[PDB]
Amino acid sequence: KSPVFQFFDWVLRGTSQVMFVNNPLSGILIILGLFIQNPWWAISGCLGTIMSTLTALILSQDKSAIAAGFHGYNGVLVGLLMAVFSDKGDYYWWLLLPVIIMSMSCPILSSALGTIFSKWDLPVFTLPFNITVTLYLAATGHYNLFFPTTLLQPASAMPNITWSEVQVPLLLRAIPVGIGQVYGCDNPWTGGIFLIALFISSPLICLHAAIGSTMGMLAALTIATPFDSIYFGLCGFNSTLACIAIGGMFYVITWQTHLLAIACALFAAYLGAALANMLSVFGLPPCTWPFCLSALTFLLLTTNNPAIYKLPLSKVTYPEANRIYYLSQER
Amino acid sequence: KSPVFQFFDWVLRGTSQVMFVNNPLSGILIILGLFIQNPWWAISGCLGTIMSTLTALILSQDKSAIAAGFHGYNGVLVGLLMAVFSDKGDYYWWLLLPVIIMSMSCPILSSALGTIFSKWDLPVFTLPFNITVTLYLAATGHYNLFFPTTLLQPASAMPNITWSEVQVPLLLRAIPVGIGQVYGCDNPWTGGIFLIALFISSPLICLHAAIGSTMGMLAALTIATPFDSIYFGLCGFNSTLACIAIGGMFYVITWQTHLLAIACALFAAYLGAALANMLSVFGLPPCTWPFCLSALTFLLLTTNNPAIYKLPLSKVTYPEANRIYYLSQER
Amino acid sequence: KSPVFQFFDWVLRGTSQVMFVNNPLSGILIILGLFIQNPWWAISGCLGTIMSTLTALILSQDKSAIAAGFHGYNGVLVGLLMAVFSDKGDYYWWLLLPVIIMSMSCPILSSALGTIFSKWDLPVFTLPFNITVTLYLAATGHYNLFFPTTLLQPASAMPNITWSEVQVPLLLRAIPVGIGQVYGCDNPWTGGIFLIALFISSPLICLHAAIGSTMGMLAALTIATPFDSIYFGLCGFNSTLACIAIGGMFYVITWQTHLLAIACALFAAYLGAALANMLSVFGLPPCTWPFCLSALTFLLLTTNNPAIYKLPLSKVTYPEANRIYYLSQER
Numbered sequence: 001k002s003p004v005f006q007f008f009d010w011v012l013r014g015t016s017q018v019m020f021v022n023n024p025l026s027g028i029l030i031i032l033g034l035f036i037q038n039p040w041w042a043i044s045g046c047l048g049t050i051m052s053t054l055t056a057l058i059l060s061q062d063k064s065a066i067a068a069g070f071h072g073y074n075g076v077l078v079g080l081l082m083a084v085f086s087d088k089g090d091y092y093w094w095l096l097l098p099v100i101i102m103s104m105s106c107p108i109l110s111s112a113l114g115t116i117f118s119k120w121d122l123p124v125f126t127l128p129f130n131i132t133v134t135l136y137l138a139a140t141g142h143y144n145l146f147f148p149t150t151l152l153q154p155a156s157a158m159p160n161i162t163w164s165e166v167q168v169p170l171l172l173r174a175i176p177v178g179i180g181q182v183y184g185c186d187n188p189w190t191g192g193i194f195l196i197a198l199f200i201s202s203p204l205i206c207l208h209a210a211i212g213s214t215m216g217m218l219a220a221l222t223i224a225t226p227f228d229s230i231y232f233g234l235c236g237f238n239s240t241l242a243c244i245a246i247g248g249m250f251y252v253i254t255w256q257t258h259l260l261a262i263a264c265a266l267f268a269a270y271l272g273a274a275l276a277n278m279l280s281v282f283g284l285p286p287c288t289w290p291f292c293l294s295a296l297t298f299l300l301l302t303t304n305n306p307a308i309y310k311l312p313l314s315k316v317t318y319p320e321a322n323r324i325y326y327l328s329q330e331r
Numbered sequence: 332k333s334p335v336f337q338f339f340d341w342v343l344r345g346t347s348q349v350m351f352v353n354n355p356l357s358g359i360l361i362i363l364g365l366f367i368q369n370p371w372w373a374i375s376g377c378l379g380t381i382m383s384t385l386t387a388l389i390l391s392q393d394k395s396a397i398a399a400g401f402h403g404y405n406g407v408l409v410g411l412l413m414a415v416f417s418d419k420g421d422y423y424w425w426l427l428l429p430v431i432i433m434s435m436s437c438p439i440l441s442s443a444l445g446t447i448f449s450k451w452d453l454p455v456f457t458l459p460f461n462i463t464v465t466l467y468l469a470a471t472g473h474y475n476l477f478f479p480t481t482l483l484q485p486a487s488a489m490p491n492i493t494w495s496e497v498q499v500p501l502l503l504r505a506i507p508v509g510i511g512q513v514y515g516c517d518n519p520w521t522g523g524i525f526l527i528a529l530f531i532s533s534p535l536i537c538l539h540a541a542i543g544s545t546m547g548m549l550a551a552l553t554i555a556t557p558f559d560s561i562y563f564g565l566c567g568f569n570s571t572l573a574c575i576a577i578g579g580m581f582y583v584i585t586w587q588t589h590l591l592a593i594a595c596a597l598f599a600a601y602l603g604a605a606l607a608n609m610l611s612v613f614g615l616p617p618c619t620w621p622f623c624l625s626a627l628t629f630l631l632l633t634t635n636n637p638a639i640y641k642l643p644l645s646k647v648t649y650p651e652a653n654r655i656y657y658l659s660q661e662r
Numbered sequence: 663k664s665p666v667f668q669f670f671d672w673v674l675r676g677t678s679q680v681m682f683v684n685n686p687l688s689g690i691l692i693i694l695g696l697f698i699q700n701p702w703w704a705i706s707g708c709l710g711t712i713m714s715t716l717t718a719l720i721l722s723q724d725k726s727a728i729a730a731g732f733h734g735y736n737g738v739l740v741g742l743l744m745a746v747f748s749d750k751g752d753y754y755w756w757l758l759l760p761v762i763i764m765s766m767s768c769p770i771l772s773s774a775l776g777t778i779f780s781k782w783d784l785p786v787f788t789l790p791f792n793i794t795v796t797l798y799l800a801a802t803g804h805y806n807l808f809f810p811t812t813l814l815q816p817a818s819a820m821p822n823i824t825w826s827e828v829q830v831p832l833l834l835r836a837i838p839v840g841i842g843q844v845y846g847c848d849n850p851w852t853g854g855i856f857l858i859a860l861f862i863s864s865p866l867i868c869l870h871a872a873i874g875s876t877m878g879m880l881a882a883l884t885i886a887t888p889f890d891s892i893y894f895g896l897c898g899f900n901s902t903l904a905c906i907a908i909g910g911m912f913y914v915i916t917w918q919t920h921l922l923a924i925a926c927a928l929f930a931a932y933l934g935a936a937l938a939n940m941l942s943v944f945g946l947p948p949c950t951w952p953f954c955l956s957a958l959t960f961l962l963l964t965t966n967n968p969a970i971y972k973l974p975l976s977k978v979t980y981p982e983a984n985r986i987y988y989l990s991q992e993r
């Protein structure tokens with residue numbers, strides 16, 4: 001095996017580890033979906049992942065958690081969110097420069113947070129992306145002269161929501177859109193590609209992703225969010241990530257854990273609305289902060305009943321194998 | 332004993348554990364005070380506590396720390412602050428719905444923060460309420476269409492404070508008002524009810540509450556806060572909570588700890604002014620964040636002199652019994 | 663030795679420990695530089711340090727880490743930043759009052775954060791100053807009536823940067839200015855005094871300070887910061903502090919650690935721009951938050967290669983002695 005082939009296998013695993021799925025075929029499907037959405041964003045995300053995992057190599061990280069894509073998944077998101085929020089337009093080639101620098105900052109953060117979380121056997125999640133992208137989008141802002149960003153400002157008037165005009169078909173379509181919005185992509189076709197890409201590896205992740213996107217869609221219909229965000233998918237990427245993380249991966253899948261995951265989707269969606277109203281004061285977007293906060297507060301949660309079992313971090317692979325491992329360890 | 336009677340004993344203990352006091356008679360007195368202030372807020376707070384402790388049951392928490400009200404005290408505050416900040420008015424029955432949902436989110440947080448703080452033998456304090464109420468009041472905001480909230484905006488002009496017009500009698504009355512404002516209630520009569528309710532169980536908690544409210548009242552007269560907030564009690568609920576927590580409960584009461592508690596009241600009041608000027612940018616209120624921050628930074632504080640002694644968390648009950656325990660353990 | 667002489671030796675060590683340098687001669691040189699800049703700020707800073715270390719005495723802290731100035735360095739910064747941001751002008755004597763109170767709050771915080779960081783063998787850094795000065799500048803604000811502060815507001819229009827008019831000599835002079843801006847002083851002469859004061863004790867700290875100030879100067883020329891801040895030194899005090907902390911002090915100096923320090927200067931400068939655009943919403947300045955955050959995330963960072971070695975906290979003195987200790991321990 002040529003080492004360059006091994007490295008590209010690593011980057012493909014990284015580009016799908018965002019969905020907690022470690023499978024290069026799902027990675028290539030997700031890359032295809034990104035290119036379907038907008039080739040510029042796909043190029044930016046691939047550059048972000050390449051530089052992130054390369055920096056992980058240079059810093060001489062643990063070689064075990066790079067063949068799992070553990071250091072690339074924070075790069076694809078940095079690239080995609082850097083290039084979806086740039087006001088200069090498409091193929092503004094200069095944007096590739098900070099996308100490099102910030103991509104070199106994901107392993108560092110991913111290391112540091114790890115040492116903070118090691119005391120509680122808790123995963124670093126998508127916090128490294130949040131810190132880096134918040135750093136960039138606040139460092140530059142909308143009025144910057146080299147890398148301006150799209151303007152986000154707090155609501156200043158009561159939204160005009162008419163429940164006569166709700167389109168249920170579009171509202172339903174908010175499920176695959178919510179799945180795809182994790183990567184920044186809103187096209188329903190890329191959402192379908194993502195759902196298929198998850199379903200190839202493990203059905204439970206796909207099921208919990210669909211349930212999470214739906215659950216967030218519903219949670220933002222209770223606090224009367226404007227319908228444009230519902231159709232566009234902005235209210236269903238924190239929810240889906242939280243649902244996947246809590247449902248069957250970090251907890252052995254069980255009906256108790258299933259209800260816990262749905263509750264986590266609720267908490268994550270409401271926290272997403274909160275942080276979106278708060279972080280829009282600075283002009284920042286809610287870039288996968290709510291998922292991180294809700295998943296952390298749902299994994300640190302302590303219970304008595306034996307059904308709610310938190311797998312040791314090393315053992316995690318995917319929900320089916322997690323359940324198989326737990327059943328084996330019971331014997 | 333009928334189990335329903337036991338559960339209502341639990342909820343009464345929870346409705347008074349806000350004042351660090353574990354006594355069902357004080358709970359019933361505080362409930363009476365709430366109903367004296369505004370029956371709508373009392374109903375909302377009782378619903379919040381009921382659902383919070385019920386969720387603690389469902390999550391199968393430690394049955395020991397529910398007969399102490401440990402999971403209800405974060406529900407009464409959520410209900411009261413949800414229903415004091417609702418712009419729709421009194422008896423807007425729909426408000427009971429989110430008050431349920433958020434009340435089901437207090438045990439979860441109270442568990443999670445516990446696992447974060449267990450490494451330092453530090454109590455979770457009122458942080459669960461802060462997170463939940465901040466989440467709600469930022470998720471909805473003042474312009475929301477289903478559950479609007481009262482508008483809070485940063486100061487935009489120099490306040491007009493005339494020291495000729497200070498009314499000392501009202502200013503003095505800011506002490507019981509400051510005691511009552513912990514629950515959101517500002518009527519002086521409910522403040523008196525609260526002071527009596529504390530004094531029934533343990534005099535030291537009442538004394539430190541009065542001292543803390545006074546100390547915050549004074550601390551906000553040094554930075555020239557507008558007098559309306561002073562009379563209304565907004566500058567004396569963080570201070571009183573901090574003074575109670577540091578004075579005789581988590582530290583064995585001693586004159587050294589007494590000065591430490593007064594200093595903590597000072598730090599908490601100034602931090603309250605700071606967070607109120609900062610958190611008002613988003614439209615959020617300073618909902619018992621300053622007390623939490625100051626009490627944490629005063630309990631993590633490390634000293635050499637043997638007088639400043641931090642009780643192990645399990646042993647805490649109330650200041651007099653704390654002192655008795657320390658004297659016994661000295662022998 | 664008269665005890666008052668010992669105490670003034672302590673305060674002189676504290677006034678230079680800001681630059682991670684423990685040498686009373688450097689302390690007296692830095693005091694001289696402060697008096698060269700503006701005598702009012704020097705008086706305020708000396709009062710801050712005196713009261714901070716005095717409070718550390720009263721709280722009966724560890725007598726070992728007061729002859730190193732460990733409790734005074736958070737007081738000089740509180741005084742200097744309190745008195746550089748006061749809108750009332752120079753020799754507004756009333757300002758000395760809160761400068762006392764807040765100076766009595768630095769040991770407390772410095773203790774508390776220590777107990778938080780002890781689990782990770784990480785230094786408390788300049789976080790105590792940040793918390794206290796942010797608390798003050800948000801508690802009072804620009805519209806306060808007793809202690810108003812200078813107005814800081816977010817950018818509302820695209821800056822007009824012309825690269826024809828860049829003055830390279832001034833731009834180069836931004837290096838000593840960046841060194842001096844740690845203490846709030848911008849005069850190039852006080853920057854030179856500071857560079858000399860560092861170079862007296864250990865050349866590596868001076869070298870890393872110059873490199874850090876330069877590296878931040880460059881990092882803020884990439885995101886197109888207005889040139890006034892570049893000349894004035896606002897973009898080079900987080901960078902220099904981070905470079906000193908990571909370069910040779912907390913890591914045994916090596917070329918690997920040198921590149922790590924330069925990368926930390928980059929991350930700290932970009933984070934400084936970010937926090938300055940964010941914290942200016944409240945009206946707060948970026949008071950040595952970026953350095954703290956970047957240095958923490960660069961010390962918690964975990965590597966495999968043996969060159970990147972993190973000294974146990976107790977052993978740290980200065981980079982040359984650190985390297986000598988590491989070489990001795992290798993044998």
Ligand SMILES: COc1cccc(/C=C2/SC(=N)NC2=O)c1OC
Pocket residue numbers: 017018020065068070073122123124125126313314316317
């Ligand atoms: C063997 O190490 C591991 C195996 C599997 C998942 C994780 C944690 C996360 S969290 C996230 N958003 N992506 C991941 O990979 C992990 O790190 C502890």
Ligand SMILES: COc1cccc(/C=C2/SC(=N)NC2=O)c1OC
Pocket residue numbers: 081084152181182183184185234237276285286287288
């Ligand atoms: C104008 O509104 C927007 C435009 C574009 C992205 C977002 C939010 C996110 S966050 C994330 N991880 N992916 C997205 O698309 C948004 O919501 C603020």
Ligand SMILES: COc1cccc(/C=C2/SC(=N)NC2=O)c1OC
Pocket residue numbers: 348349351396399401404453454455456457644645647648
């Ligand atoms: C036996 O367990 C306990 C007994 C007593 C007080 C506490 C802590 C707190 S903090 C607060 N605001 N309310 C409480 O009850 C506790 O939890 C550790």
Ligand SMILES: COc1cccc(/C=C2/SC(=N)NC2=O)c1OC
Pocket residue numbers: 412415483512513514515516565568607616617618619
């Ligand atoms: C318009 O000003 C206000 C109106 C109502 C409540 C508050 C603050 C609090 S915080 C708390 N735990 N109880 C209260 O009453 C306030 O201050 C911002």
Ligand SMILES: COc1cccc(/C=C2/SC(=N)NC2=O)c1OC
Pocket residue numbers: 679680682727730732735784785786787788975976978979
């Ligand atoms: C022996 O104890 C020590 C000796 C030397 C440096 C430190 C840490 C810091 S961090 C900072 N900004 N100033 C300091 O002194 C320390 O505390 C752990």
Ligand SMILES: COc1cccc(/C=C2/SC(=N)NC2=O)c1OC
Pocket residue numbers: 743746814843844845846847896899938947948949950
């Ligand atoms: C109007 O702009 C400013 C005026 C004055 C100080 C600063 C920032 C800092 S932060 C620090 N530790 N020393 C300084 O000088 C600033 O930048 C916001």
